[PDB]
Symmetry: D2
């Protein structure tokens, strides 16, 4: 059936990411923002089914913005919750991703240099957007996307970090740098390791729900 998406539950409690991410932000980010992206996606898919059947290409093009923005929001946030875990969990330990860290160290020199290069790209985003570590054929790359544009060009997304203001403003105010340093404590490196070992279809299996 067309447009039958639903909001998946979190793999953890709303306060499980504290003190890195407050329980209020996790509640608003998931139950409000992410829910809205899922809802408007279903409506857009149902409206597109009408235009596609009638061969109304002007209406299909006019609907592309709503599908890209809302579909990407559901895609990016579905990835986001999976690659986040409480700091106490062993998944937050970079040692749980031995093959990923080896390629990371070969590319940027070390894990600390990659976190510096990753952090630099996140703080350099002008406006709303995301920062991603992706997998291209042979090596790795740091890429940024604006608003809710997803990584659907062929690359294998390893993990992403939301730099939208709704993700940190209630706790860090304008201090986005403090939000980046603290989010490294809640990065699920086990999820990042698995996605790095699978192909594109494997990473996009989180979309089942």
């Amino acid at each position: 059936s067309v447009g039958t998406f639903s909001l998946p539950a979190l793999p953890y409690a709303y306060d499980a990411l504290e003190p890195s991410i407050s329980a209020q932000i996790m509640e608003l980010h998931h139950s409000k923002h992410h829910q809205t992206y899922v809802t408007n996606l279903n409506n857009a898919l149902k409206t597109y089914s009408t235009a596609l059947a009638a061969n109304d290409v002007p209406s299909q093009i006019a609907l592309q913005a709503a599908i890209k923005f809302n579909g990407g929001g559901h895609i990016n946030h579905s990835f986001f919750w999976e690659n986040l875990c409480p700091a106490s969990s062993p998944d937050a330990d970079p040692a749980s991703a031995p093959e990923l860290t080896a390629e990371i160290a070969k590319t940027w020199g070390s894990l600390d240099k990659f976190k510096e290069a990753m952090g630099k790209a996140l703080l350099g985003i002008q406006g709303s957007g995301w920062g991603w570590l992706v997998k291209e054929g042979s090596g790795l790359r740091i890429v940024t996307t604006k608003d809710q544009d997803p990584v659907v060009g062929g690359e294998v997304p390893v993990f992403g970090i939301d730099m939208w203001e709704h993700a940190y403003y209630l706790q860090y105010l304008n201090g986005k740098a403090a939000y980046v340093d603290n989010i490294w404590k809640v990065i699920n490196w086990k999820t990042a390791e698995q996605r790095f070992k699978g192909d594109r279809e494997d990473a996009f299996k989180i979309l089942k729900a």
Copy 2:
């Protein structure tokens, strides 16, 4: 069924727009460039029907560029043939559009002042694109689009001018100014007048000929 578009024939012979536009360019623009947009549009639409049925959102988004580029190219060129006619034809006479030219004169002062602003936007396009005169809830307006992006935002397209290099290069070389000055001779004001009094759905009836 989905993606069943075909190339519509021109309203005239390939040499009817000479000396403004050569017969070689008109044939290549129509039989080659426009045909490719029609063909690849059908392919993109058929692949999307699979993705929409399977609820494959990653595949649907990745196809948007192919649909917008090919669908817009088919739309813009389908408009293009309709709003062009030979200079000798009475449809190329601006007197065939009394309500449009009056509204133009109320907006820019006169038709020649409108031709000055329109030509400036066409020559100011950086790269591939189009120039259009549309009708909004405010009046008339000159808008430009990049590559093959169509005017599907709600405005009613009155007439457009293709500024792609494949539309003039074989005859005017890099002299796009000479291509703009001469294309004023073959502007179908009858089509522009008809579109100016109708709505979006009326103007977009030319797309049905492509089935």
Copy 3:
């Protein structure tokens, strides 16, 4: 000398716009966000003076993003403080703009119909951006810009509304609709009336206070 901008003070106290906009947001928006745009603008302008003197075209192009983002942020926010006033002030009364409201009513039918179209564009902005009412050679128009892109294309900006999340999130959370409905109470119609009768150079005199 080049890059000598400073943050201009607000025309009121930080709590003068309550209850529409909280005092905490106004202080952060002004003393933190706007200050960063002013500071980083100066840095970008000083680096460009070196590149322009040395005729370093690669370095000049690479700096355009920093100049547009920081310069536009300083421009938009400088406009923002001027066209906002407390709801109790007589400047927030639409009767202080008889020529603007008459032109608005001729365009959208009434002021309330204009408020409906303006609010729709603000809530329809995907990501960070602004909404503006400008004055062209046609009349008035509602335009939106992304991130901190300013309205420097020729139009005369009448008034704008900041739709960045840092402008309302600490008080209205994700409820941007409530932020738009309440901001209508603090719109300085006196500033909008003054800008509506002047030209681009008159409206852009507020930037001189930043020296």
Copy 4:
């Protein structure tokens, strides 16, 4: 002095690239299109000097489009002529670039696979633009730019291919695929080898003229 650029002469004759590129196209591409980019660049730089002195930021932003478009056109075309040579020259032999081809073969598998991946990106450009082989920190990448956007983000440009319609239409008509296959005969691999061995400042030394 501000805006004192001039059109550099070609390293070869107008018919030296035949039969790959006709003498008419080389004459129009260089003496007309490229000359226009240089001329409008100088004017834009002189107008910007006025705005920069008066601290007219709105005028500086409004001039960014003319500087990016015209400055990039002079930059891209200055690179283009240098990495082009007659087919008979030994510089058109890929064996004149042993270190570049070794990295090419390590990335895409072989030279023929890179030419296929490069050719695919060139024909996939929607509208006017360029295709480039660039050098990023450790490895190589195929990137495309629209219109006259230059590669000024930090990467080291190795060589580029113009996919603008003014570069091939007078000879290959709409057959851009035939234009891509034939341009491989006139690729100056010696120029590509040197740029790959130097840094960013070395590649942008061609701008001296």
